[PDB]
């Protein structure tokens, strides 16, 4: 309830770790009845955040997932809800990921 905004570092990840659809990075815990809202990477992956593009060149074929205590990736429409409360985040590959910056945006309200 205190840290309203926070930056969760996912690390530096080499392309061969995200080389095919389904590939995942090392998850990274973070905490703070919760629905998450973000831009889907594409219409086949509503549970994956699109990366914000960079003038330096952003990475492709990869986005960011959010998982609750169940270990499942949460849907990102601000309507699907998950059951302090910890989470973890990670990269998800939709193809052969290419190099570049890989930052991602989300928000969350809370419901009782």
């Amino acid at each position: 309830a205190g840290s309203v905004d926070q930056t969760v570092q996912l690390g530096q990840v080499r392309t061969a770790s995200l080389a095919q659809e389904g590939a995942t990075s090392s998850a990274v815990g973070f905490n703070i009845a919760v629905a998450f809202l973000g831009t889907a990477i594409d219409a086949g992956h509503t549970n994956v955040l699109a990366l914000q593009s960079s003038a330096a060149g952003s990475a492709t074929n990869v986005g960011v997932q959010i998982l609750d205590r169940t270990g499942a990736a949460l849907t990102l429409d601000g309507a699907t809800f998950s059951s302090t409360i910890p989470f973890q985040a990670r990269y998800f590959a939709t193809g052969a990921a290419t190099p570049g910056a890989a930052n991602a945006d989300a928000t969350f309200k809370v419901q009782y």
Binding site: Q12, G57, P99, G100, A101
Partner: protein, 205 residues
Amino acid sequence: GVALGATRVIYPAGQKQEQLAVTNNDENSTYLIQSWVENADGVKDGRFIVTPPLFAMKGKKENTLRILDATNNQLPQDRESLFWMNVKAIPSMDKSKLTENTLQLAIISRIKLYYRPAKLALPPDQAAEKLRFRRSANSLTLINPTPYYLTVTELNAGTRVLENALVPPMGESTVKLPSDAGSNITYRTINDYGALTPKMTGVME
């Protein structure tokens, strides 16, 4: 085998150290990992320290090379300086082929180390577009007015594909130009992340 976690290291001036991953992915093999830094002419150079300079990796394991700044702030502050990172992977005793005469190889992986000064004016993404070209009957010269080393590739002159070129900051580089080379030039570059940049139309000087 052994691999490195980057095709290039951008050393931001003023920072104590930078990291470079080394990995071995074979549980049944052990490597000795020796690492050192050379200057642009390939000569062993001590203005950058690598620790550990020599260590073992037993089986599947990821280790971290630390690249420490030892320049004492003597490098130019208006342009990248070029160094080369060397990581030798020495294998071990293949007792299977003992009775045999053997050619035994070790692997050295060489990647660029760019000392990038602090308050550069032009952002790195805007470097590639500034490349300019000068053309002669059988040679083509690339002109880099930026402070950043430009690694130029997919260099095309008409139908004919030319050598890659490494164009120094505020310097030039020349490549050979066949007779059947065409007029219009396109190129790409390799950026800080190791990716290819968008195809660009070459602009005459």
